[PDB]
Design a protein around this ligand. Structure first.
Ligand code: NA
Length: 129
């Protein structure tokens, strides 16, 4: 599924991401935009052989099991393919564990490089939220 900007914002808010660990909703929408272009089916391989999955590009090195990342962890206790669903529940619940791990949203390279320190509230402007 390719989400619209306000559609995703509304769904993230319903799932409790707005101001989760202090990150306003615009941060999460900005992160999804530059991680996946709002596409739930996005995948990208990393140099170490792990793979990033879904709208928030969650990595198989730590967070999910894809059967092809030996020596890795599965801290969200899910198969990585669950992160590609049109239903973003699994992605959001796993993202809540990531952002809680001590590094905040700095865990997402695209957030630190393209969202942090910008006007992230612009990403929800015009939405009925
Ligand atoms: Na894994």
């Amino acid at each position: 599924k390719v989400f619209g900007r306000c559609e995703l914002a509304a769904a993230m808010k319903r799932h409790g991401l707005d101001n989760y660990r202090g990150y306003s909703l615009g941060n999460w929408v900005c992160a999804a935009k530059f991680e996946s272009n709002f596409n739930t089916q996005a995948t990208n391989r990393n140099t170490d052989g792990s793979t990033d999955y879904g709208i928030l590009q969650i990595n198989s090195r730590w967070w999910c099991n894809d059967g092809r990342t030996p020596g890795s962890r599965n801290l969200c206790n899910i198969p990585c393919s669950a992160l590609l669903s049109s239903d973003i529940t699994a992605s959001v619940n796993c993202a809540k564990k990531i952002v809680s791990d001590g590094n905040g949203m700095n865990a997402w390279v695209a957030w630190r490089n393209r969202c942090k320190g910008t006007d992230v509230q612009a990403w929800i402007r015009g939405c009925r939220l």
